[PDB]
């Protein structure tokens, strides 16, 4: 109520910017702020409060602030030498932004549901999730973002999506990631080298995310199947060959013509470093396949499953023999061959 005075407006606005919660935002206070803005104009201490009220109630206020600039004055108070005293006494974008769910939920409602009339559980807000214990206490009930891509760079949401196995979430993530990989590629569907290091950083983030969850996404597999025949072998060798290692377990006869034919055609005509890199990638792929197969026996049978890895081992052995014949018996390649056979 003290916002009517023009002398106490900024300090009271700064105080309300800290004392504001969700149960305090109400339509008549929104109208009060609107008439104050109409009477005084564009004030930063009012713009910040309006942005906060919009964040707490997006279905009543629409504000798009331009830029972060200093809204509240950072004037050191008269107790700065006392603030330091009490401190020394107490010594001893490609990826979408994180936002709440769309306000279209419960948009058209005639009456209040039977759940909230009886004060049941409900759900847990997304802005309150800031630490690990808060995730532990509310792991079974969580609020999903409006855009699933924002989950890619959040550990607390990765821990949740590690064990969900939901169809709509997987479909949304698949569509978003597939479109992003298709539009951001450097040699597929467009000649745009302007991206450059951006695509490399995106691939590094994807690889770091898929090292967690101990599995890979289907969008990466589709992108690999699409963009492999057009690859040259030097643009993003590291990230590409690391993405190749996270391929789901399947029969060798089906996955051979899509990946291994092009891999061999690029292998038999490249340098020795490419050979060592693809040998390392194949070793990592075999390790991942064995790790994922070792857990299924504790739960096509195993007879048809061992044939695939046997054919893979024979194929990589043939590759190694031909490469040793081609490279004139170089020990730098024999080291990688023996490293693979060690595993």
């Amino acid at each position: 109520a003290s916002l009517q005075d023009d002398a106490l407006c900024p300090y009271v606005c700064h105080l309300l910017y800290l004392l504001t919660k969700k149960e305090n935002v109400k339509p008549f206070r929104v109208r009060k702020l609107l008439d104050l803005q109409a009477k005084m104009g564009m004030q930063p201490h009012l713009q910040a409060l309006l942005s906060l009220y919009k964040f707490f109630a997006p279905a009543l206020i629409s504000v798009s602030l331009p830029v972060k600039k200093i809204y509240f004055k950072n004037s050191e108070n008269l107790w700065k030498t006392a603030l330091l005293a009490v401190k020394q006494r107490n010594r001893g974008s490609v990826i979408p932004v994180l936002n709440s769910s769309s306000y279209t939920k419960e948009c058209g409602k005639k009456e209040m549901s039977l759940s909230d009339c009886l004060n049941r559980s409900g759900s847990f807000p997304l802005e309150q999730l800031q630490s690990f214990p808060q995730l532990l206490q509310n792991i079974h009930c969580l609020e999903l973002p409006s855009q699933m891509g924002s989950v890619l760079n959040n550990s607390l949401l990765l821990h949740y999506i590690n064990c969900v196995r939901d169809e709509p979430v997987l479909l949304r993530f698949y569509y978003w990631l597939s479109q992003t990989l298709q539009e951001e590629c450097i040699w597929y569907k467009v000649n745009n080298y302007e991206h450059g290091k951006e695509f490399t950083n995106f691939l590094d983030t994807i690889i770091r995310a898929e090292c967690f969850l101990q599995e890979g996404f289907y969008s990466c597999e589709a992108f690999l199947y699409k963009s492999l025949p057009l690859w040259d072998g030097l643009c993003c060798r590291s990230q590409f060959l690391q993405l190749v290692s996270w391929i789901p377990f399947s029969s060798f006869s089906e996955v051979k013509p899509l990946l291994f034919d092009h891999l061999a055609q690029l292998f038999f005509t490249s340098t020795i470093y490419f050979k060592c890199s693809v040998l390392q990638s194949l070793k990592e792929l075999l390790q991942n396949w064995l790790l994922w197969l070792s857990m299924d026996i504790h739960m096509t049978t195993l007879g048809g499953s061992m044939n695939s890895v046997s054919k893979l081992i024979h194929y990589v052995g043939w590759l190694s023999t031909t490469a040793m014949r081609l490279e004139s018996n170089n020990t730098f390649l024999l080291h990688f061959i023996l490293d693979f056979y060690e595993k």
């Binding site: 060798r237 590291s238 470093y273 060592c276 390392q280």
Partner: peptide, 12 residues
């Protein structure tokens, strides 16, 4: 890593 090292050996 090993792949980045192979890359930087290829560049030289």
């Amino acid at each position: 890593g090993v792949l980045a090292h192979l890359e930087r050996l290829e560049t030289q």
